[PDB]
């Protein structure tokens, strides 16, 4: 009758609510984060979408560290990305400095 576990923690507990992250126009981002379990997947959300490793962005995961390299950060790029994790996520303000045409 009785089942369920509780108080799960997916991400560390030294982190940030938000991380605001600033990139330069036509730089590489990286938006880092540990996470409380390797196993663990995450799934990076930009203005609540899923986000998909393509050329432009690579959702890199090392071991306990996930990184999102954000190729040529343009406006377009710029935003919040938020990595989503089981049943919790962060955020990370990606602002973009001058402009590059294109």
């Known amino acids: 009758g009785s089942s369920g576990s509780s108080g799960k923690v997916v991400?560390?507990?030294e982190q940030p609510a938000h991380r605001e992250v600033?990139?330069?126009a036509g730089a590489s981002a990286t938006l880092?984060?540990?996470v409380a379990q390797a196993q663990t997947e995450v799934?990076?959300?930009?203005?609540?979408?899923?986000?998909?490793?393509?050329?432009?962005?690579?959702?890199?995961?090392?071991?306990?560290?996930?990184?999102?390299?954000?190729?040529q950060a343009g406006q377009?790029?710029?935003?919040?990305?938020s990595c989503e994790a089981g049943g919790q996520q962060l955020s990370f303000?990606?602002?973009?400095?001058?402009?590059?045409?294109?």
């Open 43 to 71: 799934t990076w959300y930009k203005d609540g979408k899923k986000l998909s490793s393509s050329s432009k962005v690579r959702v890199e995961a090392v071991g306990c560290t996930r990184r999102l390299v954000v190729q």
């Open 93 to 102: 303000r990606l602002q973009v400095a001058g402009q590059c045409f294109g």
């Open 76 to 81: 377009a790029e710029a935003g919040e990305y």
């Open 22 to 24: 600033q990139a330069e």
């Open 32 to 34: 880092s984060c540990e």
């Open 11 to 13: 991400f560390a507990k």
